[PDB]
Design a protein around this ligand. Structure first.
Ligand code: DMA
Lengths: 191, 191
């Protein structure tokens, strides 16, 4: 209905539609990236993969194949009924090898779901969210120039979370994190 | 200071500062508008005022003196330690005499506070807000073209609420509502 149409018209009016694909070279070894680079699952156990510098070795993260150094961009992710997932953006310069907390101070702007029902923003400390309708599809919205990262229910247009406006250092990558083994993959919607 | 600075630079990149004054001709007869038209209080009982067509006769509402038919606008409101208030925008065509529920379907976009601690967006159904620090000062952000109404803690830049993007009909007015008789006024910050 009207709320979906207005969500469509807003994203079209102001945000460059990103066509995002997963970069398997960056993916933590426990992650499985689909051949078409749209879908993300977790393996039972870490695969034997090279620890090249670009690969996340601690966090169960993967990046997109393109970064943003300017402009407004959006993309949508089919989270469906998956009980655990976090998505957003992170800086090129994040710690990929050693333990760090995924927080804006450490260069990550992400939100998501734990244990089926606990929505959080990964602020420091974590922000417990109240979500009246669990999203099946999440829109990720970036405005580089104003330091804005926001998240919507892409089916009904309802707002989920907006980080405080910040200042970004260097390129921002789409980032995806899953900690659990379960049937429903994360799937990127094509532009 | 960084969150405050980014909030300031965001308002400057995108939103025209509105210099909002209260129109006493619109004010429910239980409301008092200050001589400088920036402050709002509540009377013990309705005062004797003309029932001109613009006046809210049921709802404890008052409008700004200027409407918006286009563009990006913000204003900030000092709610201070008030236990109760609602602010936002409404259409020119809202029902002013009969009761109507203050919902987007009826042409009202407001959030506020009840009972000192219950923050709500007056969506339908109402959205329970979780607010980590009670705001003293609230920024109201309108984008007419994309049908966007959003609200921020104007002192730390944290986001409070964004309504689903919608389609506005006709001019929008700043609206302000207080239901309680309590020591702290509602006061508009000058541009
Ligand atoms: C691989 C792994 C156990 C990461 C989760 O990080 P965390 O326990 O600090 O939690 P979160 O980032 O979800 O707050």
């Amino acid at each position: 209905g009207e709320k979906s149409q207005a969500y469509a018209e807003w994203k079209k009016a102001l945000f460059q539609p990103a066509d995002v694909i997963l970069d398997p070279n960056t993916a933590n070894p426990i992650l499985l990236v689909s051949d078409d680079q749209r879908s993300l699952q977790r393996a039972d156990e870490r695969q034997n993969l090279p620890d090249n510098p670009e690969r996340f070795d601690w966090h169960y993260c993967v990046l997109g194949c393109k970064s943003f150094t300017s402009g407004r961009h959006y993309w949508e992710v089919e989270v469906g009924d998956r009980k655990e997932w976090h998505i957003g953006v992170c800086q090129e310069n994040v710690e990929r090898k050693c333990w760090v907390k995924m927080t804006p101070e450490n260069g990550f702007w992400t939100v998501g779901l734990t244990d089926g029902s606990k929505y959080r923003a990964l602020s420091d400390p974590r922000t417990k969210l109240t979500v009246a309708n669990p999203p099946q599809r999440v829109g990720v919205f970036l405005d580089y120039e104003t330091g804005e990262v926001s998240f919507y229910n892409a089916m009904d247009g309802s707002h989920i979370y907006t980080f405080p406006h910040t200042f970004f250092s260097g390129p921002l990558w789409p980032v995806f994190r899953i900690l659990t083994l379960e049937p429903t993959a994360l799937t990127i919607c094509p532009a």
